Amino acid sequence: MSLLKIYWRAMQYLAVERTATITMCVASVLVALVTLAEPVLFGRVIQSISDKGDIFSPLLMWAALGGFNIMAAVFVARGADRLAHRRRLGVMIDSYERLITMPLAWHQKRGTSNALHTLIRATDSLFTLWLEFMRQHLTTVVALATLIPVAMTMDMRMSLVLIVLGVIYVMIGQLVMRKTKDGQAAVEKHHHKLFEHVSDTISNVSVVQSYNRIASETQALRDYAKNLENAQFPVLNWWALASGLNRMASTFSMVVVLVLGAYFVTKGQMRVGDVIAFIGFAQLMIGRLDQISAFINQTVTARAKLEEFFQMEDATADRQEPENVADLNDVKGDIVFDNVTYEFPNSGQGVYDVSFEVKPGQTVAIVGPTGAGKTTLINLLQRVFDPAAGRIMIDGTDTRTVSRRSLRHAIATVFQDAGLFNRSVEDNIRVGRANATHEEVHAAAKAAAAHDFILAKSEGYDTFVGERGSQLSGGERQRLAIARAILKDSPILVLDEATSALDVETEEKVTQAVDELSHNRTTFIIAHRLSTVRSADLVLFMDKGHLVESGSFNELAERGGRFSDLLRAG
Amino acid sequence: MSLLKIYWRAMQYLAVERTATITMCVASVLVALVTLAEPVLFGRVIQSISDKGDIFSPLLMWAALGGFNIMAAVFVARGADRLAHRRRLGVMIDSYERLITMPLAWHQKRGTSNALHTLIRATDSLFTLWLEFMRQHLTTVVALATLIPVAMTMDMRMSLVLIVLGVIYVMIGQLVMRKTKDGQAAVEKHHHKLFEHVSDTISNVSVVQSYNRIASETQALRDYAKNLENAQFPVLNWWALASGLNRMASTFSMVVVLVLGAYFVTKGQMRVGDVIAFIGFAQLMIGRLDQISAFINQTVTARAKLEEFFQMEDATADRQEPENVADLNDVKGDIVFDNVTYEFPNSGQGVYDVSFEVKPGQTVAIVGPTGAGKTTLINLLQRVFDPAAGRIMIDGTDTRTVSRRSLRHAIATVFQDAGLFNRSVEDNIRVGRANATHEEVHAAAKAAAAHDFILAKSEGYDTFVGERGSQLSGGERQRLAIARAILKDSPILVLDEATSALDVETEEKVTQAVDELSHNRTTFIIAHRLSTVRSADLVLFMDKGHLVESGSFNELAERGGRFSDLLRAG
Ligand SMILES: OC[C@H]1O[C@H]2O[C@H]3[C@H](O[C@H]4[C@H](O[C@H]5[C@H](O[C@H]6[C@H](O[C@H]7[C@H](O[C@H]8[C@H](O[C@H]9[C@H](O[C@H]%10[C@H](O[C@H]%11[C@H](O[C@H]%12[C@H](O[C@H]%13[C@H](O[C@H]%14[C@H](O[C@H]%15[C@H](O[C@H]%16[C@H](O[C@H]%17[C@H](O[C@H]%18[C@H](O[C@H]%19[C@H](O[C@@H]2[C@@H](O)[C@@H]1O)O[C@H](CO)[C@@H](O)[C@@H]%19O)O[C@H](CO)[C@@H](O)[C@@H]%18O)O[C@H](CO)[C@@H](O)[C@@H]%17O)O[C@H](CO)[C@@H](O)[C@@H]%16O)O[C@H](CO)[C@@H](O)[C@@H]%15O)O[C@H](CO)[C@@H](O)[C@@H]%14O)O[C@H](CO)[C@@H](O)[C@@H]%13O)O[C@H](CO)[C@@H](O)[C@@H]%12O)O[C@H](CO)[C@@H](O)[C@@H]%11O)O[C@H](CO)[C@@H](O)[C@@H]%10O)O[C@H](CO)[C@@H](O)[C@@H]9O)O[C@H](CO)[C@@H](O)[C@@H]8O)O[C@H](CO)[C@@H](O)[C@@H]7O)O[C@H](CO)[C@@H](O)[C@@H]6O)O[C@H](CO)[C@@H](O)[C@@H]5O)O[C@H](CO)[C@@H](O)[C@@H]4O)O[C@H](CO)[C@@H](O)[C@@H]3O
């Protein structure tokens, strides 16, 4: 009963556009009625006083009906294609807009590559379902529902024979389908195994001739081929059935209905027009049942993907409530933390309660071991989630009562694997500020010493960079991120190992630039290297969610035991 | 006219199996004849003295013909599937056996990954061509060739009307196909561009929220969607034409032929049976022409791949002549080189003429700069090609008059990227000797110190390793290759930077093992590191295909100027 829910949800999403869907129902009903009436008219024209009499009017009206069917067949397909494409693009808009504001926590919880794979796969499958169902699978249901009573009231006995033929055909089709699906597991296992073997043993191209094993490899692959043939032999007939059962049933039904009609005419109570109309009914229903079976098979194959997409959409549906809450302006940088604690893996907290205060005009540097407390500190600085216990206040205002719009906008960010778009580097620089303009970008590039490297080389500053910096290295995207951060001129800068990918000569000038360009702002630098930490003001210590050392450079010379050991070690 | 050659070659390859192909021709002819005779019998039974008279015999014979058609439809499909699968496996056998003996020079000239891609792609396409043509595309040609004269001699005027309908249908189908293919370029460009954009901007998942550009990204993607819709709008009707022209032409032809027949009957010179037979002929030819058009479209799509496969097969066809030429036995290792020269890129030789002699019981080490002469030296040692000018002699016998069977079998090989199969490590060790057995493999593993690393860890010595050592590192495959080389106990060992992927403690013991296990054999070690070269006997020098220094360790202390500088440098 799960599939019916899927169909109901798909139709509910489809029925959003009410200005172009109402005509589809009437068009489908009209085409079903005309395709049902065509064989009856064929019978009427064939049985016209043997073969003489006024037949000009029946021929004319049949030709008019055929022309109407032609026009409907042309127009409905185009309408369905347009509506399906528009609805696909609209649902893509909705899914994108709903997912872009979704926090990163759930993204890293469920993964991102799988999310994209399922999203585009489900969009394609749902588009396939929306389109094919508007052309050849909505009219068939109406045609059958109208055919059953007409055929019954015409000749109930032939009607029940017809129903028996239909049900036996669908049963044998289902049996054939299930047998084929049972055989595929073994057949693909052997098939993929053999092709993997041959791909490896040819792409190696260095060990097939480094072993002198032409004969052994040939014998092994012959044995694999023999095994595959022995596995294929049991399932051969079912392929023939699955390939020709439509024609099988069509011919069988036509022969049986024609011989039954002739046998009844032998006594004499009917004509030939109704017989040929019944033949047309039989072939039409056989074709439509084949189409319906194919549609059901496709839906069963895609059910898992559609169910996963629906589950993801429902999971991302329930979100926060938009409101015009008061924001903050002219941020200074006086952040206070009290009793902040958050559990990342839900199996033990990484950080403990802490009471910290940072004042404007003084940078703060934290250095620690391989513990994960620094990441939690950065996350609570950015406020990417709702802390379970703690208090974060800015400028006399709580961070929970301030919307992300300004609260973030006052805060920058630079990490190691800074995502770069796949478009040009010039746009990847202009994306540092909302609109900006093309004179200060050069100043930012000079300030980060990233102008000469991109102007002379890289075919100018208008080159397309690949995904995840596939064309550049760590240092190049590093310098680009530094340039973006400095041109953004955010009041607060947060740093996390943002200088660990260049040699000493460039590292020294990068540190000098980021220090000379940042005096009236507070920076939070987090790095294992002990080169950029000496240019800070406040020195902190991290150890398994605890505080031991928190002071300046003129107090750490004799305070603490582990910090002195770390300082003398390197 | 190129396609006809492709069809001829495909049929020539198919006709190899003459014991199961002759029956296919007669089966196809019989099914074509019965499917042509079915509508005529339908007409005969419908037109049987109005609707009275002896019709039991026509019904019985028609039912027998229908049963024969049913049996043929069941049996021919299975026969075609079996024959196509057997022929596919056979041609795979032939291609593998012909390519495995193919030298590596052409493989690296044309590439390997592309070779595999085209080989399996062409095999799949050729199997598709072999199968579909045996069921629904060989009988149609015979059916048409038999229908044209029968229909002409029945009613030439309706026959020419039928031919006109067929030709106009195929012309409009071709026009529709070409218009669709013309639109494909633009539609796919915009489609892939939009999906690449959305994939990048969702998989980044770190910069859509690091820019505060929800509105800008939404507007940009809306503009992209609008552009895609504006590009899709011009091509909408042509899609409807392709997804319904079959039914279009079928209905139009049926209506026109029936109205023409009724108009001729109005005067009165014919009956209804021939009319319904003509209707059946029209629908049958419409369906078969649709199938033929689809087949031609598929063949045009696959023509490039088939042509490339045929060209590759012809290129690899012409090879050497097998012969029982005299081989060598009990190799010692006294190799002489004189005036050997070979050009790798055909744009300048890398090596020059040289006169070198190596004696048994003395290893030879060559050290040189980043020049490519060492690779040429190794290649001429292995004799993987035919040198243009030079003389290589072993044991009083030329290498050109000795087959590769023994000439190689006396020679081992170890490189950096030693190919490992995707199967278990135990087999990757047993592949060092032809048959061997499971006691000396442990001795070899202990000798290379590769037993403890694989027994305790890696879930025993029966673990599956990925392609190109995807699961292991350089050191592990390194030690496995060293173990394979030492267990192969070849009279001559050639080394090429085969010790450059481990720390000093393991490198020292590896060198000690390979030296203690090799005294009565000559080894050729080629490495840039100056650690394993000191354990050699004869010291050589390489410089741009020249000889400067060639002696022992007791002569290099004052001979040469560059060698002393290199020795003191590191
Ligand atoms: O405007 C509007 C419009 O549109 C349109 O559309 C368009 C488009 O565009 C679009 C887009 O698109 C996209 C796409 O898509 C995609 C993508 O993806 C991705 C990719 O992917 C991939 C894949 O691949 C794969 C592979 O695999 C495979 C293999 O195989 C193997 C095997 O095995 C097997 C077995 O065998 C057996 C046998 O069987 C047989 C059968 O037979 C049958 C048949 O039937 C049929 C027919 O058909 C016909 C028709 O019909 C149709 C139509 O439709 C239309 C449409 O249109 C549209 C609309 O919308 C408008 O207009 O479309 C469609 C499609 O969908 C088409 O089709 C058309 O066009 O219509 C009608 C009406 O009525 C209906 O019906 C339907 O629908 O028609 C025509 C003429 O006629 C044609 O077409 C055709 O022909 O029919 C029938 C009825 O009548 C039925 O039944 C069916 O349907 O055939 C025959 C005749 O001919 C018959 O008779 C029979 O019955 O078949 C099958 C198939 O083929 C098979 O099965 C076979 O062949 O049997 C025997 C005995 O007999 C035995 O013995 C054997 O064994 O089988 C089994 C079962 O179970 C299994 O196993 C299988 O299957 O084996 C062999 C030997 O061994 C060989 O062959 C081989 O080996 O392999 C594997 C393993 O084994 C398997 O499994 C498989 O299957 O593979 C590979 C490697 O690995 C992988 O990869 C995979 O897996 O696929 C694809 C496809 O496409 C491709 O492409 C690729 O390659 O990938 C990549 C990555 O990067 C890329 O490329 C992509 O991306 O995409 C997406 C995602 O993203 C999605 O979507 C998808 O997925 O694509 C393209 C390119 O790319 C582009 O375009 C795009 O992208 O999108 C959308 C939608 O979707 C939208 O937006 C648009 O628009 O385009 C298209 C193209 O296609 C066109 O077409 C159109 O135009």
UniProtKB/Swiss-Prot annotation, chains A, B:
What are the residue boundaries of the ABC transporter domain, all occurrences included?
Answer: 335-569
Keyword Transcription attributed: no
SMART domains from the UniProt entry: AAA
Chain sites annotated for binding ATP: 368-375
Please tell me where this protein is predominantly located. membrane
Record-level Gene Ontology MF annotations:
ABC-type beta-glucan transporter activity; ATP binding; ATP hydrolysis activity; ATPase-coupled lipid transmembrane transporter activity
GO cellular component terms listed in the entry, alphabetical order: plasma membrane
Q: Where in the cell is it found?
A: Cell inner membrane
One Pfam family per UniProt: ABC_tran
Q: Where are the transmembrane segments?
A: 22-42, 55-75, 156-176, 248-268, 276-296
Membrane topology of the entry = Multi-pass membrane protein
Which SUPFAM superfamilies does this chain map to?
Answer: ABC transporter transmembrane region, P-loop containing nucleoside triphosphate hydrolases
Catalyses which reaction(s)? [(1->2)-beta-D-glucosyl](n)(in) + ATP + H2O = [(1->2)-beta-D-glucosyl](n)(out) + ADP + phosphate + H(+)
Q: Which family does it belong to?
A: Belongs to the ABC transporter superfamily. Beta-(1-->2)glucan exporter (TC 3.A.1.108.1) family.
Return the PANTHER family for the record: ATP-BINDING CASSETTE SUB-FAMILY B (PTHR24221), ATP-BINDING CASSETTE SUB-FAMILY B MEMBER 6 (PTHR24221:SF654)
Q: What does this protein do?
A: Involved in beta-(1-->2)glucan export. Its export to the periplasmic space is required to exert its action as a virulence factor. Transmembrane domains (TMD) form a pore in the inner membrane and the ATP-binding domain (NBD) is responsible for energy generation.
Q: Give the multimer and partner information.
A: Homodimer.
What is the official name of this protein in its record? Answer: Beta-(1-->2)glucan export ATP-binding/permease protein NdvA
Q: Which organism is it from?
A: Brucella abortus (strain 2308)
Q: Which gene encodes it?
A: ndvA
